[PDB]
């Protein structure tokens with residue numbers, strides 16, 4: 001876990017050292033979620049001053065997208081090819097979080113790729129990073145995602161989590177109630193049929209007995 | 214909605230009757246309601262059982278049966294040119310307007326579902342409106358058209374699942 | 388790093404072996420056995436497991452290679468497509484005796500696995516652990532140690548039915564079917580409710596704020612609905628309509644039988660012979 | 661203790677074998693107990709046999725009126741329902757395996773034999789009856805076990821039957837429950853002819869304390885496979901065969917109706933009901949899965 005080491009070695013640094021460390025961790029391969037570094041009080045205090053651009057860059061990398069970076073290109077500091085690649089990977093993950101069959105057109109529009117080969121190479125790299133598992137379909141121009149990692153969350157996002165989990169629990173409870181009711185109905189029907197058949201047989205036996213005498 | 218209840222009321226009023234014969238306004242309303250609902254057999258039999266005295270007394274039944282015959286022949290230009298020939302006062306006007314709208318909608322659906330290349334004049338005759346505005350208004354609906362050949366191209370448009378299965382199993386196993 | 392699939396038959400074999408040896412000897416004693424399975428690429432799967440014969444001299448354990456070879460021939464006679472995978476033992480954490488026996492076994496296969504089962508445990512999770520051998524250089528000295536692997540329980544219909552029957556050991560039919568499904572759905576509900584509680588408790592503020600758990604909860608919540616695609620819907624409706632037609636034909640057959648019985652009784656009653 | 665049954669008493673077994681009380685009676689053995697491991701091994705071997713038939717051997721003991729089974733080991737036979745026993749390969753294999761297991765700690769002795777009847781019920785055919793008769797005539801005791809690995813999957817419950825035959829010339833006095841079992845047309849004559857020469861023991865299963873603890877620990881991770889089963893796809897050739905057999909039986913019933921054992925229409929109706937009920941169960945499982953997973957739109 002490179003993020004743990006970066007957090008450990010970020011205690012005494014501030015200012016220019018902090019910005020250099022932020023650039024290094026953003027460029028570092030392997031790390032894809034930056035929540036604790038943003039949670040650091042020093043990093044959150046970096047807002048006051050002339051270095052708020054680096055805090056905005058970190059916020060973009062935590063919760064952001066390539067169209068957001070394009071819209072806010074001037075304010076943010078310049079990024080290298082590795083940082084752009086990481087941002088594109090995070091954009092793919094963000095799309096796959098809400099859509100499980102991503103068309104090629106939206107990916108091309110978001111990542112500003114020109115030819116299909118570059119986009120497919122980028123998707124292959126993202127797959128090989130073990131941050132998104134899926135398959136590419138060329139005939140239908142689709143990318144089918146089986147698994148995608150959970151990106152960084154805010155403090156106000158957890159309401160959606162609790163709402164979805166509440167809905168799932170309610171669905172499970174309703175299914176259990178339906179199963180119980182169906183079992184009860186089936187058992188009652190079987191016992192009723194058996195009782196009726198036994199009563200009919202008893203009446204037939206009584207009729208035969210009174211007739212044979 | 215507003216016509217089904219009126220049809221039921223007119224049917225009941227005719228059935229009760231002061232001796233079998235109903236008032237001519239009710240006869241006309243019933244005939245036009247049968248025409249509106251495309252119950253052609255019911256309208257055909259209703260006209261057959263209308264007494265000749267009522268036929269001679271009121272002339273609007275003749276026009277209503279003219280509309281009915283045009284519908285029976287499936288002649289859309291006849292329907293459109295025969296609807297706009299007579300009128301009454303609020304007794305049959307709203308239902309005849311509804312009949313015109315229903316005929317327009319039915320013609321649109323039929324042309325859409327049973328044609329892939331129709332001459333613009335024939336499409337205008339089917340719909341009822343003259344050629345120019347019909348060809349103007351098909352494109353906003355998504356229908357391809359092209360000039361110098363006037364060939365319009367129409368385009369063709371629960372928790373009880375366990376209960377039923379449990380019922381089936383309980384019946385089969387008994 | 389290879390993905391490992393376990394089979395409950397192996398665990399049952401080990402547990403029965405240990406219980407039998409303990410009952411026979413009066414006091415608990417550790418047992419040594421061998422595993423059998425198939426390796427496909429990097430996917431290792433274990434299916435069955437027999438027992439090996441071992442002796443102790445001084446403080447070292449030696450495996451009878453002659454007995455191993457005879458057993459290998461015997462099991463190749465029956466399970467033609469199965470092969471040797473590693474060895475299993477009962478105990479706690481690995482020991483130098485285990486390292487010695489692993490060194491002995493390594494003369495047979497290239498990279499044998501190592502399974503350890505703990506009969507005397509107090510934890511909540513299964514005491515089965517899987518290790519593989521890794522040779523390293525520490526302080527300029529060559530030593531081979533253990534690396535733990537993550538295993539998943541393999542899926543099989545007959546195995547599932549047998550295991551469920553043995554675990555349960557207990558007047559309709561829909562009854563039974565629905566009861567099984569109910570037990571599993573109950574387990575799911577419990578787990579999802581405990582997760583929702585943690586999440587709600589963390590949101591309101593009762594436990595230290597954890598980022599990894601919350602991110603994983605978000606990822607879990609983003610996995611629903613599962614397979615809402617048109618091809619899946621078409622396949623599902625295909626299956627539903629097929630079962631519906633079969634039910635229709637069965638209903639027709641039952642009605643024909645009832646009709647035949649009624650016709651027989653009517654003919655007997657209302658006919659003058 | 662529960663593990664007491666796992667203790668093998670050589671002296672007691674020898675005394676019981678030398679003081680055979682089953683000679684005076686005929687229905688002496690009425691209870692058959694099977695360990696958990698033996699049952700699981702039997703079921704997995706029968707399933708892995710596929711559509712063909714497999715047969716092995718069973719090691720256990722006897723406790724008074726009941727017959728206990730502790731282990732089971734397969735023998736090769738190349739399977740494929742060969743004519744009978746073996747080109748002597750299995751003949752050597754049985755003794756070799758028993759001798760090898762003797763020097764490890766498996767000190768129990770054989771008590772019966774098991775085999776699979778995949779797709780056509782659990783009963784003893786003519787050759788099976790002759791085999792069991794021959795085995796009981798000389799080496800006693802001995803029990804036959806018949807498994808149905810396909811009906812097990814189809815119905816969700818194991819189809820295992822333990823049987824023991826009667827001596828030659830012995831006529832058992834009535835007492836025939838004869839619960840209904842669906843059997844195809846090509847295998848009905850043998851079942852009809854050879855049905856009073858054997859009787860079915862009452863079978864129960866047992867497990868040890870460590871086995872119970874391990875199973876209750878394993879369920880916590882094994883509950884997934886119940887919710888991801890999809891039994892409607894794994895069993896389709898079996899359902900097709902059942903429908904074919906049912907159609908043939910319906911044709912025979914119609915022929916009997918046209919003509920002038922009893923009421924084959926009722927048997928055909930029961931077969932159709934069983935098949936349809938299994939199919940509807942398979943469908944309602946998938947309906948439950950869809951309701952649980954596909955509707956919880958985030």
Ligand SMILES: [Zn+2]
Nearest residue numbers: 775777785788
């Ligand atoms: Zn047989």
